[PDB]
Structures are given as C-alpha cells and as structure tokens.
Amino acid sequence: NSYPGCPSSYDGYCLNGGVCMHIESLDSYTCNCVIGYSGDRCQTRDLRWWELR
C-alpha cells in the first residue's frame, strides 16, 4: 500500500529531486529530499548529489 505518489493537489511542491511520500496510514504527506537536496521543502540543490556527469 502506501500508494506510491502523492495527491495531485501537489504536482508541483517537491523541489530538486524531492520524492513525495504518502503514508496511507495518516494519509499525511512529506517530501523526502536526498543527498544534495534540502532547505524548506528541498530547495537546496547544492554542489553535492548530482556531483557531475
């Protein structure tokens, strides 16, 4: 379950490689950034993740 994705109401909230998670349990929502994505939602795309290539 967990429904892979997130309420279309979003379709434009997760920033820079921001994976939108949706736990069916609490039906809540959250953007899981990554190894080079952070800040408010994940507006921090710094010299890290993507590295270069």
The two tokens of residue 2 are: 């967990």
Residue 3, exposed/middle/buried by CB under 10 A (0-12, 13-18, 19+)? exposed
Do residues 49 and 37 lie in contact, with contact meaning Cβ atoms separated by under 8 Å? yes
In angstroms, the CA 16 to CA 19 distance is 9
Q: Which residue range is the domain that position 37 belongs to?
A: 1-53
What is the count of structural domains for the chain? 1
**∠ at Cα 19 (6, 35), nearest 5°?**
165
Distances (CA, A) of 38 to 1, 23, 50, 51: 27, 20, 13, 15
**Is 1 strand, coil or helix?**
coil
Please tell me the number of Cα atoms within 13 Å of 11 on its side-chain side: 3
End-to-end CA distance of the chain: 35
CATH of the domain at 27: 2.10.25.10
Distances (CA, A) of 30 to 2, 35, 38, 41, 44: 12, 17, 13, 9, 16
In angstroms, the CA 7 to CA 27 distance is 10
